[PDB]
Design an enzyme around this catalytic site. Structure first.
Site, PDB file in Angstrom:
ATOM      1  CG  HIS A 183      -1.962   0.961   1.312  1.00 33.70           C
ATOM      2  ND1 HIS A 183      -2.009   2.068   2.169  1.00 33.70           N
ATOM      3  CD2 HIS A 183      -3.102   1.049   0.561  1.00 33.70           C
ATOM      4  CE1 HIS A 183      -3.154   2.734   1.865  1.00 33.70           C
ATOM      5  NE2 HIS A 183      -3.840   2.157   0.907  1.00 33.70           N
TER       6      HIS A 183
ATOM      7  CG  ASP B 161      -0.671  -4.211   2.455  1.00 29.96           C
ATOM      8  OD1 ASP B 161       0.070  -3.702   1.562  1.00 29.96           O
ATOM      9  OD2 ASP B 161      -1.269  -3.533   3.317  1.00 29.96           O
TER      10      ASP B 161
ATOM     11  N   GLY C 195       0.149   6.326   8.713  1.00 33.43           N
ATOM     12  CA  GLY C 195       1.538   6.725   8.903  1.00 33.43           C
ATOM     13  C   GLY C 195       2.323   5.593   9.525  1.00 33.43           C
TER      14      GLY C 195
ATOM     15  CB  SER D 220       0.629   2.030   6.511  1.00 32.04           C
ATOM     16  OG  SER D 220      -0.657   2.429   6.950  1.00 32.04           O
ATOM     17  N   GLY D 221       2.867  -0.399   7.190  1.00 32.15           N
ATOM     18  CA  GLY D 221       4.093  -1.058   6.777  1.00 32.15           C
ATOM     19  C   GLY D 221       5.100  -1.209   7.897  1.00 32.15           C
TER      20      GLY D 221
END
Length: 224
Positions: free
Chosen positions: A41, A83, A174, A176-177
């Site tokens: 993403h 993801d 923010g 994310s990942g």
């Protein structure tokens, strides 16, 4: 990170941030000197990777460009399945006490396991509060059966759910990942959840790293 606290200084050396125009875009994890693992993403054509400081904006930190990245080919923007993405650093990360590789998992840690999710994502929701210092929150892994009660058939077997009952403690935009670490190993990457963030009894959803070990090692090998 919602309802967390600043991480202890020096305890997240494998934590990185992906920047775009000197602003936070996503979190990530250092796999080795050449590679960062993050969410699919977070895809961009170019990245600025911040390494080696718990403070975004630190002059002490390394700032490395990344011009190549590879998403897992089963990634879906519709469902957020698979993801994950590997980001190839233009030059090698210079390792030290503040820059270290994460311990990738051998096994999948079970439901009820205590974990720590970290990041520079907003600490409030819907209103945005972006911190300078890296934030931490403890969560417990939630069974797929319990997680299905909330997200139904959107949930897949390679997704991992974590949170605290009747608690706002969670990851937000923010983060994310970014990493979810349980018993010394990377168990998940912050993938998605409800919006606004920190909604009680709505788990954070993570990419279950233990189910992707082969593709992770095979992709680094093929694009070395």
């Amino acid at each position: 990170i919602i309802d967390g606290a600043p991480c202890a200084r020096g305890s997240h050396p494998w934590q990185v941030a992906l920047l775009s125009g000197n602003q936070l875009h996503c979190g990530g994890v250092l796999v080795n000197e050449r590679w960062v693992l993050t969410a699919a993403h977070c895809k961009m054509n170019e990245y600025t990777v911040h390494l080696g400081s718990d403070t975004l904006g630190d002059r002490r930190a390394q700032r490395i460009k990344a011009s190549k990245s590879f998403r897992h080919p089963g990634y879906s923007t519709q469902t957020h399945v698979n993801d994950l993405m590997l980001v190839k650093l233009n030059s090698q990360a210079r390792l030290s006490s503040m820059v270290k590789k994460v311990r990738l998992p051998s096994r999948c840690e079970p439901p009820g396991t205590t974990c720590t999710v970290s990041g520079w994502g907003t600490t409030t929701s819907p209103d945005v509060t972006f911190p300078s210092d890296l934030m931490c929150v403890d969560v417990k892994l939630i069974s797929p059966q319990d997680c299905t009660k909330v997200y139904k058939d959107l949930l897949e077997n390679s997704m991992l759910c974590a949170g605290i009952p009747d608690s706002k403690k969670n990851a937000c935009n923010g983060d994310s990942g970014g990493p979810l670490v349980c018993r010394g190993t990377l168990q998940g990457l912050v993938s998605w959840g409800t919006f606004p963030c920190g909604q009680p009894n709505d788990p954070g959803v993570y990419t279950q790293v233990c189910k992707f070990t082969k593709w992770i090692n095979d992709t680094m090998k093929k694009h070395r």
